[PDB]
């Protein structure tokens, strides 16, 4: 069975960590034709490590690579390291602008070690952070999508103060998540979708009933969505939408909205994607686990689910 | 098997609708002994025809009731009345006196007709208002607390604008709603409840990187709790709390923050319960279904639920 259906990035993460286990062991799993769609980035000497470690020497050569975030020292597994920490960076900026100027249609990031970044000196607040800073957008012009137990929830703000967010919603910016949102829905898989907006306000403000959100930034922004040729109901009270369970992309306002129904039904399972302009990036859903780093304990589960994930065809 | 484990009062709800009807084939439901802790509250006129009816005659003679809403002309099934808007309000408000002065200790309303109790010229807004309006309280001193699926939410704020609500809250509002949702669990039958109280913000504030709110209104709150020797985690993000799943009670701050949770894992088996001094009132999760109003085919089964969470054992 074939998982891989389009080009991908796949940066290692931390090469101390068992990111370049994980990494070669997913793509172990791949046929021959999978491997190609899986451009590689990272430090190649920590590939090779990880590559006499689990004995997997073989399948260096079927990979495409490109060097990135290169160490000055030999890898040292289990390490925390400002080295390493540049590195993951390095790797993880090297694919998005893979992303960015075509080569690729989405990328994963294998885990990073927030400490070792830190320790470099690099700003690291999170991927959504990450990629804004990479392709010169500001952070509210990328949208985080959960996606778990069926469920895809794109977020027209995110993490800021409840009435900040407030503040910022308008019209435009909750069609930017959507258009984002849509095309993102296209890479996983349903070219089509139904769509829902959640309300601002209770009962999507009931009208004007509670409060006038919704009738200058949810109505409008539904109306102009549905002109363009989309199908999308709403807005609607965000409890009762959910609970229908019959579309395929939720558009929350606020953090909590979206959050609640996703870590409470996908504890393990899902998904966060950072969109912006083309690049579609997902972590593998675990940290870095330094203890075990080159000691073949981890499994790439977490990884080919990802891929899974944004390897589905259209 | 016996559900009813204390004295209950049942207001009957819109006499022209299914209230009646359900009513009957709840108490028809449950044991000689169980029916006497439940004093009816309405019209015997309406009891009388939804005997006939559902044809429970032998049942009238064992009720406990209580006339309250007469009517002063005969019962039309399934019309919208000004009168039979009245009656609701009447039976529920001879229902909540009756638990106010102690001879029961909650109160369940079966369903009303907005439209009906507008058209008497009566302000309502839900049983968070009546209750309050008919305790001598004001109307942010009742609280609704959701119950579905083993959770208990109780929110500070509830039908209003997220912006008005970010205006009301206080460390006073969250310190009345939390008692008033700990005096509520130990007649649900649980007395001394572990509470978790949601972040205002993401993260709950994240101390106070994500906004000030949550520094100033649930983190003071929280202190206080304690000092009074209450068992209170947080406050924690909603979403992650939710998902540990080991508190009693946990405390919303915002409409949406409880009601997603809640109708998503049980999006029909969802019990209301406005809270006001000693008074915890329930609806039924239903409406007044006026169409079928008469023709004997109305399940009791929501109300049945609501009689078993309110008559809780311990
Ligand atoms: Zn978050
Ligand atoms: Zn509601």
């Not at 991927?127 to 010169?136: D, H, I, K, R, T």
């Not at 967010?165 to 930017?176: G, K, T, W």
């Not at 109901?233 to 558009?251: E, F, I, S, T």
């Not at 870095?288 to 589905?312: F, H, Q, Y």
Request: aromatic letters at 2%; hydrophobic letters at 45%.
């Amino acid at each position: 069975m074939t998982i891989v259906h389009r080009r991908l990035a796949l940066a290692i993460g931390d090469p101390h960590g068992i990111g370049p286990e994980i990494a070669l062991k997913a793509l172990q799993q791949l046929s021959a034709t999978e491997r190609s769609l899986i451009k590689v980035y990272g430090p190649w000497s920590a590939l090779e490590q990880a590559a006499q470690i689990c004995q997997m020497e073989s399948l260096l050569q079927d990979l495409i690579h490109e060097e990135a975030g290169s160490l000055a020292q030999p890898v040292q597994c289990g390490e925390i390291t400002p080295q390493a920490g540049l590195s993951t960076v390095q790797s993880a900026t090297a694919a998005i602008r893979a992303c960015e100027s075509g080569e690729v249609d989405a990328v994963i990031a294998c885990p990073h070690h927030e400490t070792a970044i830190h320790r470099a000196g690099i700003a690291f607040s999170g991927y959504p952070s990450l990629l804004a800073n990479v392709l010169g957008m500001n952070e509210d012009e990328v949208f985080l999508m959960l996606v778990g137990a069926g469920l895809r929830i794109v977020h027209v703000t995110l993490h800021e103060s409840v009435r900040s967010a407030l503040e910022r919603l308008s019209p435009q910016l909750v069609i930017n998540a959507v258009d984002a949102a849509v095309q993102t829905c296209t890479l996983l898989g349903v070219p089509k979708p139904q769509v829902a907006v959640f309300g601002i306000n209770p009962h999507a403000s009931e009208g004007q009933l509670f409060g006038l959100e919704d009738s200058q930034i949810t109505v409008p922004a539904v109306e102009t969505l549905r002109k363009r040729g989309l199908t999308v109901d709403g807005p609607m009270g965000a409890d009762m939408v959910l609970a229908q369970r019959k579309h395929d992309l939720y558009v929350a306002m606020l953090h909590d909205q979206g959050h609640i129904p996703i870590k409470l039904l996908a504890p393990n399972g899902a998904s966060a994607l950072s969109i912006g302009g083309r690049v579609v990036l997902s972590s593998v859903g675990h940290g870095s686990a330094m203890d075990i780093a080159g000691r073949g304990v981890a499994d790439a589960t977490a990884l080919l689910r990802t891929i899974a994930l944004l390897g589905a065809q259209p």
